[PDB]
Amino acid sequence: SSARDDKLTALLAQLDSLTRELNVVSQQLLDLRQQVSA
Amino acid sequence: RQVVDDTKYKDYQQVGILHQHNNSGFVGYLAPTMREGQAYPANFPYPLIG
Numbered sequence: 001s002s003a004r005d006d007k008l009t010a011l012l013a014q015l016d017s018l019t020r021e022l023n024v025v026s027q028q029l030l031d032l033r034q035q036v037s038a
Numbered sequence: 039r040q041v042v043d044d045t046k047y048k049d050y051q052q053v054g055i056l057h058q059h060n061n062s063g064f065v066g067y068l069a070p071t072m073r074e075g076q077a078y079p080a081n082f083p084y085p086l087i088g
Contacts, residue, residue, distance in 0.1 A: 026045055
């Protein structure tokens with residue numbers, strides 16, 4: 001079953017980038033929220 | 039224990055072991071060898087108290 005593990009290890013590598021590019025948005029949204037506070 | 043919150047804390051910077059310099063000029067860098075560096079205010083860890 002070598003042809004089916006590539007579909008899963010490529011999904012783990014792109015959820016890696018998805019939870020990382022969402023992680024910089026969740027840190028830039030609390031920057032410009034507390035920028036409105038001043 | 040309590041750790042830092044990488045989301046809610048505004049001034050958080052993920053400083054890895056290569057750049058954490060507590061006991062800077064009195065402790066060998068990344069090794070049990072002889073000391074190296076200068077005396078300098080630390081950057082790790084973040085204060086949980088005070």
